[PDB]
Design a protein around this nucleic acid. Structure first.
Ligand SMILES: Nc1ccn([C@@H]2O[C@H](COP(=O)(O)CP(=O)(O)OP(=O)(O)O)[C@@H](O)[C@H]2O)c(=O)n1
Ligand SMILES: [Mg+2]
Ligand SMILES: [Zn+2]
Ligand SMILES: [Zn+2]
Ligand SMILES: [Zn+2]
Lengths: 1473, 63, 244, 76, 63
DNA sequence: CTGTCCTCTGGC
DNA sequence: GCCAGAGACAGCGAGTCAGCAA
RNA sequence: UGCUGACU
């Protein structure tokens, strides 16, 4: 009978220090805690009043033993006051900004009172009052602010419960942080100008006031006690009614002894790390108590008192935070280390507890148990026990279990009594078990702990759990004589199990209410589709794909007896007749087709009442794989009308198609995906099981699959071409490298080696990667030439009869990159995206000359695994294969952290009963989940191109799911009228960006006015002479209430999902779905007309069908979609050119939210006008940066009289694409470089111990060092300068300075843009597009070219710059597009409904907030936010603020032992009386 | 003085005769260092072409 | 495992009369699925099979030294000539019968002799089942080892993947009713877990801070939460909890 | 009165679990069981017959609730 | 690998020591296997392997 | 080994 | 008062099995 | 607890 009482809220505050007393059984005084023999020494840390530490003893405080005694608290009473280590830093500030003389803070009372009032208003939730108070102040003190603040707090009370929400915690956080950060600095005192008694704290345990005295915690305590008195009204709000006394400790609390368990350490049998810290405090207390007595029996004595104080304070620090004090040793870890880390106490024993009734063993392939079952090896089954209550309808089978005993299988290990408990049957006398088989049904009934009984439900987990499908429920099929847990192969891809030693865990629910959820929710057939993109997860693999593709091929004929025994061996049917087919060939000999075997297996599995399905699709095996012989042309035949590439199932009977991986597989829209749509998830599991069994029987009985050497071999007469191509490839190095260094086209054979060496020993190393790339391209051309010679038709056996092809080609295993690289080429090795690295001497391998041009020396392997690879190629291949593993390890290490952070922020977002996605505190993140509802897995067939399937299978879909009942219980008028209104509006307004307005609509008289009326005036008030006539005619010279130009200019009706509640309102669908339905109805009523088949479906029954199928795919209330978004962004990354890629970019976007990204960019289309195309050339040449260093030949420095001649470059080769002129360049030196030069000369010397004339004169007017430069009337011939510092300066090779400065000196550049470039083509549809990409980011510096470039369509990857020029609703879409483009480079595709939620959460509160440790500060849950990271900072915060927790997060709900507030726990049950 | 070493652990290890190919590989092992097992960057794991004939490309633990 | 990195567990012990027998009377003793080759490209196993079959046939002993067989002199050519010199076929395929239906399979199978090693990892050393047993005495949770009985750790990844199913009661079972579950009782007015104290024997828990015994009520709470409250009190922090 | 009329899958799961935990504690079965020893099969048999006197109390995010009958709820 | 670890039992008193009963010497082996006689300590057995898909229990790395 | 804090310090 | 100098400072995947020494 | 091996 449980306590029955539940928790609503947990608040963290500070204990008085006077109420801790009476929370204390006794004061401990004896240092030595371990007795001579290992027992507790009286009055020591381990005592018998602080509780029995072990079961041996009984506590003195309450007589009770271990395992039944809640431990008790005790206190080491300290000799003198010490500061508390957590409230210490704040104390320091409370003493830094304050007058020790006046005892008042040095802050202007304006700030004090403003912040006081803002806190008073925040305490009730009022959030506009904050800025209203601040503006009331600035426009104007206590009476001015307190009136408004009291009016708010009074008119807006009843909101103390509705104040624990994000956006109310962020504001208080920011206010108090800004206060502590900006207004607590040491300042001259207001009232007495000399009140800076500068407290300045050294390492912790040390505060020093000046006239350099040592602040004694008693003097600091009195200072705080007298400062509170003057400034309490203000601080009681900055700290909650905090007493200043809490900032100081007069005793330390020793926790109960049951929580401090003695283990062992080197050379010490009984020691806990926590007692070793508390023992050090007790030992210092004893030394200090002696010195005080020495003073009583009475500078060294008091210097010793001040030194032992500092030591005791570092001993009380270490007790709180092992690493607060770094100069002490024998320091075991404090409480900050007991709580805050991955080892910790939250990420272990709090979120990751260890569980009973669970097994773990190696998993083995089964395949002869149904896909929803696990095989249990009779050793778990005899130990795993479920507690079944005994009742009239089970007392018979329970009686057999208690009789069978603890060791026979349908048995039981124990039986729990009504009031007593735990009478174990494990005896093997077989008579007392019978003595107790009676007395069952002889209050709460006896419960028999029965064993696993062949129908039980078990949760199975594989340990890298990266998605929801990694935990699924299975049905306990008991197997005898094994120690392995057997699992079907359709459930492999879901877990990623591989049967190579693959331990897996099995959990056994014990509640009968978690069994209901394992059956209904966690079942393994509700898990058919992955939640990432809704595509199927379960499917057949390997030889069930090569078996089904070779049986469903056109030339497979079976006699009656192989037809049968192949149907019954796939079925193994248990009930009802087997419905057979008719022979396809009836005459020369009755024969079947193999497609008929699959057909007849398909019409028996589909449920009896339901009718077989129709299906049309494509096969994975291309119809070109079968073309042996050159194809000829028949005039009227479309070869694809009758091809093995088109799968056509017509009423459950396969009529055409091979049925490879595209069906039976993990590919969407196949046969099993449609089975799962029309008939449910159990029928798709049945289909998978039966098809696996059939395709196994086929290969095991009549056919066989193998992979010899005559299917990897290559024809002769085809290896001769391969050999000649490999011979040709050994001559393509010189040309490649040369034409990449832009060297003279020929005549240089040794200048090229020297240029390569220079590029290799260079500093930048980007003229070396150029050679690497332009060499890889040549080698890749050659490699592609070789594959074509051998792989398609140079093989000895072709695809229908090749075993390697037909394994990579039907999706069984491998890719076309594996088939090659086994035959005819291994390829070009690439380690970091580059060729193998060279040695320090210029050779890549000891076998190769230095700087060798042959591609072989760069990792181009022309050998194959058929005929092995030579030693040098072996080396490069090993380098690559090894970097692969290193990268795997590191990548997973980073992905784990990314996913943990994401999951720790988006976990509380669940769909509510009003279809709105709200967080734990009620903050609305989205008003409709995917922007339309419609969870992902159900929206797979609502795409167009899947309607011709729903139309074909209409009768099955209505009978099996919606039925005639729902179609006629639907009333669509409210939503249908809304769409009619929308359609009419959009009919009257084709261009929806045309500035509709009443008055604007009353500009059709425009000609009426411009004709003669307004011809006489000027711009009276800036508007116009002719605009005033329109204003006069409209204003009051129009009808009173019949001037209705308004209706012709009114807004579009708002979308239906917005007004008409998509769940309870029929026909209320999304504006993009109804368009698709209209298009398809129009393209389907014009197909029925020319159909030669009878269609008994009408466009207006298909419409209702689609509308019901939409209304039903609507994201059940309680879905917890934020966790699904987290896991869907995590799993693909965890598993898996001038921009960033991979997890670096994902972490830049999500976890960091940086304003500085490594590769910022832009892309504005070019306006498509003849003038724009001409102006853009100049635009590109205008924004590239030209730097003094990019235009210079060499300097000539002479040296205290230091001359300098720059000698600039000729315009032939830099004016072409930089838009510069020599007068501007030289003028730059006179005004910027030649004064930054003196700036740097002072930077060094501060810590060292007719017309030529006006230019020179003004220049030396401004500086006192220069003498005279030069002039160059002919293209900058000789332009030097002269300086001199005559007395004493450090004459060294100052060329260093004037060269380190002539690099970061840029003539002129647009801020933030480093280079532009016009990537000519970006489209094929409208190929005419041009894009001006950039590698910097300055949005406003492009606004000036709104006629050259399209400033709508401007894009940047920055997301902080977009959020500052266009707003936050425009940064949402940039975030979403960035995540999508990051995932796209790998072929991954996360559903948009997940990125929508992630972007809506990140940009919730007006700013692009990072999804990381600093984003949780604006979070309304202290118990969360401390289960993530920096748990001790978030605990100190929550403690000095009195922060309250509502126990509504998943973390706060799992910490205090509640039921999470999403999914199954979102409602009550309320049994009525 | 750490002996001019830079490492203070894993200096001696158990030689286990599970097989004679586990045993013979304890007297031919060369450990880059025990501290490098804790590093973000992986550049002491690159198999450079200067260990040709001195270290085996294939024989390296694979975790 | 083989000598080429093809490790795998033993999944069945196929009866000797259900194995596909060859036309020579033989019957394999290892069955190896042919789908580990296409993605792993261990073409050395397909050559070792032929080399070992040729060795067993001719009483020879061939060497598998790397880099001894070139493109011109291939290994498959060499060992297929060896096989064809023994009456077998070049490509190393002998045709089997089905030991279950008795019919000659349509495909001729690739059979040979390869050298298998047995690995030291056995299910007998890696299998665990726990029902009830020992407990960490600081947190009162399963102990966490296999030599000791020990429980398996559920984990935060598993806790976050189990509440994506909407199963809050499977989570309640695993994390609460199986690992740690206590009945620590609190003073309802003071709202403190440390305050209720037993008496000296009508055994009434009496609140120490306020002397009332009508205010104490039992709450079902984890044990690590009581440990957490105790170690917080150690720091003078107070956890005030609202009972309903 | 404004929430969806159907019974979400989480509600079906929790109602089956609670009805099963009741049946197992010796509660009268109003469904005429026919030899099955599983309380969850019996709970499904009862849910299919529309005999479950439980009141789903759907909570809205502001504390307001709506009390639906398990009989007056469209089970898919 | 479980093999033949040594010849002196009755003397070692190790903790664990895995022994294979009847090891054989590979019929196909590199010549270096014969320079360091590694047949004093064999490691496995020769088996007649057929590469066939026949059972339904040998898929995904199982044998 | 990276990016923000973030608390000085220091110069201006 | 404006914004570099830093100089701390915190984070760094999940699970599992042993042995040995202190 | 630690540290040295190892498994997916
Ligand atoms: N440190 C690790 C190593 C492995 N794992 C897990 O084990 C799986 C198989 O490892 P694996 O190394 O066998 C990869 P697989 O694709 O199966 O290999 P193949 O190409 O030879 O078929 C990985 O995908 C992870 O889920 C982990 O969580 N942590
Ligand atoms: Mg594996
Ligand atoms: Zn007690
Ligand atoms: Zn003052
Ligand atoms: Zn009380």
């Amino acid at each position: 009978n449980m306590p029955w009482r539940r928790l609503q809220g947990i608040s963290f505050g500070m204990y008085s220090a006077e109420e801790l007393k009476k929370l204390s059984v006794k004061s401990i005084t004896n240092p030595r805690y371990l007795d001579s023999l290992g027992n507790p020494s009286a009055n020591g840390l381990y005592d018998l009043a602080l509780g029995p530490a072990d079961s041996k003893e009984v506590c003195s405080t309450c007589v009770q033993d271990f395992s039944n005694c809640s431990g008790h608290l005790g206190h080491i009473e300290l000799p003198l006051t010490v500061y508390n280590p957590l409230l210490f830093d704040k104390l320091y500030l409370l003493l830094r900004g304050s007058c020790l003389n006046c005892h008042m803070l040095t802050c202007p009372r304006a700030v004090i009172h403003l912040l006081l009032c803002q806190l008073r208003v925040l305490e009730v939730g009022a959030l506009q009052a904050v800025y209203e108070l601040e503006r009331i102040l600035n426009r104007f003190i206590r009476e001015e602010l307190e009136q408004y603040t009291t009016e708010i707090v009074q008119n807006n009370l009843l909101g103390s419960q509705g104040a624990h929400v994000k956006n109310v915690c962020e504001s208080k956080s920011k206010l108090i942080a800004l206060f502590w950060k900006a207004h607590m600095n040491a300042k001259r005192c207001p009232h007495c100008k000399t009140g800076r008694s500068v407290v300045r704290k050294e390492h912790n345990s040390k505060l020093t006031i000046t006239f350099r005295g040592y602040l004694t915690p008693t003097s600091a305590r009195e200072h705080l006690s007298a400062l509170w008195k003057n400034e309490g009204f203000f601080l009681n709000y900055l700290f909650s009614r905090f007493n200043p006394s809490v900032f100081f400790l007069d005793f330390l609390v020793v926790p109960p002894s049951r929580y401090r368990p003695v283990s062992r350490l080197g050379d010490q049998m009984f020691t806990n790390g926590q007692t070793v810290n508390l023992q050090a405090v007790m030992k210092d207390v004893v030394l200090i108590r002696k010195l005080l007595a020495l003073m009583a029996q009475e500078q060294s004595l008091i210097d010793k008192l001040y030194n032992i104080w500092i030591r005791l304070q570092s001993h009380v620090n270490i007790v709180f935070d092992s690493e607060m004090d770094k100069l002490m040793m024998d320091k075991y870890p404090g409480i900050r280390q007991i709580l805050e880390k991955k080892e910790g106490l939250f990420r272990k024993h709090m979120m990751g507890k260890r569980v009973d009734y669970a097994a773990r063993s190696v998993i083995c392939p089964d395949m002869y148990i149904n896909t929803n079952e696990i095989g249990i090896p009779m050793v778990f089954a005899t130990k795993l026990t479920y507690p079944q209550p005994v009742t009239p309808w089970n007392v018979q089978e329970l009686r057999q279990a208690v009789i069978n005993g603890p060791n026979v299988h349908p048995g039981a290990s124990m039986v729990i009594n009504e009031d007593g408990s735990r009478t174990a049957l494990s005896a093997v006398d077989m008579t007392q078990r019978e003595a107790v088989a009676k007395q069952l049904l002889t209050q709460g009934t006896k419960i028999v702990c029965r064993h696993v009984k062949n129908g039980d439900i078990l949760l199975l987990n594989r340990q890298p759990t990266l998605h929801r499908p990694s935990i699924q429920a299975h049905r306990a099929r008991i197997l005898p004589e094994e120690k392995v847990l057997r699992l079907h192969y359709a459930n492999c891809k879901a877990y990623n199990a591989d049967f190579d030693g693959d331990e897996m865990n099995a959990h056994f629910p014990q509640s009968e209410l978690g069994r209901a959820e394992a059956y209904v929710l966690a079942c393994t057939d509700q898990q058919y589709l992955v939640p990432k993109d809704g595509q199927p997860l379960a499917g057949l693999i390997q030889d069930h794909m090569v078996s089904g593709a070779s049986m469903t091929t056109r030339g497979c004929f079976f006699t009656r007896e192989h037809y049968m025994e192949l149907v019954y061996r796939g079925l193994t049917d248990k009930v009802g007749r087997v419905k057979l087919l008719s022979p396809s060939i009836l005459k020369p000999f009755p024969l079947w087709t193999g497609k008929q075997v699959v057909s007849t297996l398909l019409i028996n599995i589909i449920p009896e009442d339901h009718i077989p399905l129709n299906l049309s699709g494509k096969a994975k095996i291309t119809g070109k794989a079968w073309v042996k012989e050159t194809p000829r042309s028949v005039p009227g035949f479309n070869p694809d009308s009758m091809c093995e590439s088109q799968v056509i199932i017509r009423e459950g009977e396969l009529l055409c198609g091979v049925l490879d991986k595209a069906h039976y597989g993990s590919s969407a829209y196949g046969l099993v995906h449609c089975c799962y749509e029309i008939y449910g998830g159990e029928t798709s599991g049945k289909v998978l099981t039966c098809l696996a069994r059939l395709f196994t029987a086929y290969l095991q009985l009549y056919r066989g699959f193998t992979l010899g050497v005559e299917d990897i071999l290559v024809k002769p007469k085809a290896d001769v071409k391969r050999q000649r191509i490999i011979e040709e490839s050994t001559h393509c190095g010189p040309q490649a490298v040369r034409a990449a260094l832009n060297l003279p086209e020929a005549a240089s054979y040794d200048e090229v080696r020297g240029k390569w060496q220079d590029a290799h020993l260079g500093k930048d190393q980007r003229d070396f990667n150029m050679i690497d790339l332009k060499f890889k391209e040549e080698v890749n051309h050659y490699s592609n030439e070789i594959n074509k010679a051998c792989m398609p038709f140079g093989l000895h056996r072709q695809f229908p009869e090749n075993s390697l092809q037909m394994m990579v080609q039907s999706g069984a295993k491998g890719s076309t990159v594996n088939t090659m690289q086994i035959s005819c080429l291994l390829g070009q090795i690439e380690l970091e995206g580059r060729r193998p690295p060279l040695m320090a001497s210029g050779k890549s391998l000891p076998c190769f000359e230095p700087y060798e041009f042959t591609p072989r020396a760069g990792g181009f392997v022309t050998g194959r695994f058929l005929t092995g690879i030579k030693p040098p190629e072996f080396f490069f291949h090993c380098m690559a294969g090894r970097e692969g593993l290193v990268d795997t390890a590191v990548k997973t290490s980073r992905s784990g952290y990314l996913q943990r952070c994401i999951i720790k922020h988006l976990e509380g977002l669940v769909v509510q009963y009003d279809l709105t996605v709200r967080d734990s505190d009620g903050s609305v993140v989205q008003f409709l989940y995917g922007e339309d509802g419609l969870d992902i897995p159900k929206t797979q067939f609502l795409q167009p191109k899947q309607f011709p399937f729903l139309a074909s299978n209409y009768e099955v879909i209505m009978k099996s799911q919606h039925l005639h009942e729902v179609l006629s219980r639907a009333d669509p008028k409210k939503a249908l009228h809304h769409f009619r209104a929308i359609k009419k509006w959009q009919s009257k307004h084709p261009n929806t960006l045309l500035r509709r307005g009443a008055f604007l609509s009353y500009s059709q008289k425009i000609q009426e006015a411009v004709k003669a009326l307004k011809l006489e005036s000027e711009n009276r008030n800036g508007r116009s002479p002719g605009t005033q006539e329109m204003l006069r005619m409209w204003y009051e010279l129009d009808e009173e209430s019949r001037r209705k130009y308004q209706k012709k200019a009114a807004a579009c009706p708002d979308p239906s999902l917005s007004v008409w509640r998509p769940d309870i309102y029929f026909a209320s669908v999304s504006e993009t779905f109804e368009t698709k339905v209209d298009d398809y109805s129009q393209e389907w009523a014009a197909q029925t007309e020319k159909s030669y088949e009878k269609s008994e479906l009408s466009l207006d029954r298909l419409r209702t069908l689609l509308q019901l199928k939409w209304q039903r795919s609507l994201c059940e209330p309680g879905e917890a979609v934020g966790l699904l978004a987290a896991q869907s962004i995590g799993e693909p990354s965890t598993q898996m050119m001038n921009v960033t890629l991979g997890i670096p970019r994902l972490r830049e976007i999500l976890m960091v939210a940086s304003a500085n990204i490594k590769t910022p960019m832009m892309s504005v289309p070019v306006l498509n006008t003849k003038k724009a195309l001409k102006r853009v050339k100049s635009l590109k040449k205008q924004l590239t940066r030209v730097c003094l260093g990019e235009v210079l030949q060499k300097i000539d420095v002479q040296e205290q009289v230091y001359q300098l001649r720059f000698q600039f470059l000729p315009h032939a080769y830099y004016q072409q694409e930089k838009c510069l002129r020599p007068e501007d360049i030289l003028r730059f030196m006179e005004t910027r470089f030649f004064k930054l030069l003196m700036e740097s000369i002072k930077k060094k010397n501060n810590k060292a111990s007719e017309a030529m004339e006006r230019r020179v004169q003004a220049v030396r007017e401004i500086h006192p060092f220069i003498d005279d430069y030069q002039y160059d009337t002919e293209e900058s011939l000789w332009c030097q300068v002269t300086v001199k510092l005559p007395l004493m300066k450090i004459n060294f090779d100052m060329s260093s300075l004037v060269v380190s400065l002539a690099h970061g000196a840029v003539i002129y550049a647009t801020k933030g843009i480093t280079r532009c470039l016009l990537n000519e083509t970006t489209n094929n549809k409208n190929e005419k597009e041009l894009v001006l990409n950039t590698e910097g980011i300055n949005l406003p510096e492009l606004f000036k070219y709104a006629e050259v470039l399209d400033l709508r369509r401007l894009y940047s990857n920055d997301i902080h710059a977009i959020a500052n020029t266009y707003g936050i609703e425009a940064a949402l879409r940039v975030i979403e597009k960035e995540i999508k483009d990051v995932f796209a480079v790998y072929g991954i595709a996360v559903d948009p409904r997940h990125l929508s939620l992630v972007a809506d959460y990140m940009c919730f509160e007006g700013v692009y907030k990072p999804l990381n440790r600093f984003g949780i500060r604006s979070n309304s849950s202290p118990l969360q936010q401390m289960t993530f990271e920096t748990s001790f900072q978030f605990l100190k915060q929550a403690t000095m603020l009195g922060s309250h927790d509502e126990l509504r997060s998943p973390s706060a709900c799992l910490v205090v032992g509640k039921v999470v507030r999403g999914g199954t726990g979102l409602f009550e049950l309320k049994q009525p009386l | 003085t750490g002996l001019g070493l830079l490492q203070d652990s894993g200096l001696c290890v158990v030689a286990d005769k599970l097989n004679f190919i586990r045993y013979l590989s304890h007297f031919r092992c060369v450990h880059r260092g025990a501290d490098f097992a804790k590093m973000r960057t992986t550049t002491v794991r690159r198999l450079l072409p200067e260990s040709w004939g001195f270290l085996c490309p294939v024989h390296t633990p694979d975790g | 495992a083989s000598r080429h990195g093809q490790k795998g567990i033993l999944s069945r012990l196929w009866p000797a009369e259900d194995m596909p027998f060859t036309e020579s009377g033989m019957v394999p003793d290892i069955l190896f699925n042919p789908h580990g080759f296409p993605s792993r490209m261990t073409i050395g196993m397909l050559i070792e099979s032929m080399a070992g079959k040729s060795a067993a046939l001719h009483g020879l002993c061939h060497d598998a030294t790397p880099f001894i067989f070139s493109e011109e002199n291939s290994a498959l050519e060499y060992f297929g000539e060896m096989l064809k010199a023994a009456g077998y076929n070049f490509y190393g395929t002998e045709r089997l019968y089905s030991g279950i239906s008795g019919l000659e399979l349509e495909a001729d199978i690739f059979i040979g002799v390869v050298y298998y090693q047995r690995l030291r990892h056995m299910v007998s050393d890696k299998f665990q089942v726990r029902t009830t047993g020992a407990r960490d005495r600081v947190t009162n949770q399963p102990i966490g080892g296999r030599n000791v009985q020990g429980g398996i750790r559920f984990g935060e990844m598993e806790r976050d993947a189990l509440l994506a199913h909407g199963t809050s009661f499977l989570l309640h079972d695993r994390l609460f009713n199986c690992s740690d579950r206590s009945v620590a009782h609190v003073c309802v007015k003071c709202g403190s877990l440390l305050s209720p104290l037993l008496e000296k024997p009508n055994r009434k828990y009496n609140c120490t801070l306020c002397s009332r015994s009508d205010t104490i009520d039992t709450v079902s709470v984890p044990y690590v939460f009581r440990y957490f409250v105790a170690e917080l009190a150690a720091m003078n922090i107070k956890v005030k909890l609202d009972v309903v | 009165r404004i929430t969806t009329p159907y019974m979400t899958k989480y509600e079906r799961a929790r109602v089956l679990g609670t009805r099963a935990l009741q049946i197992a504690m010796c509660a009268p079965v109003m469904v005429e069981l026919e030899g099955e020893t599983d309380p969850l099969l019996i709970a499904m048999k009862e849910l299919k017959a529309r005999k479950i006197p439980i009141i789903i109390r759907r909570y809205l995010p502001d504390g307001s609730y709506e009390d639906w009958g398990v009989d007056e709820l469209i089970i898919t | 690998t479980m093999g033949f670890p040594l010849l002196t039992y009755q003397d070692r008193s190790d903790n664990k020591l895995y022994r294979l009963q009847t090891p054989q010497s590979p019929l196909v082996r590199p010549s270096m296997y014969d320079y360091y006689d590694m047949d004093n300590y064999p490691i496995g057995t020769n088996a007649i392997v057929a590469v066939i898909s026949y059972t339904g229990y040998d898929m995904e790395d199982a044998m």
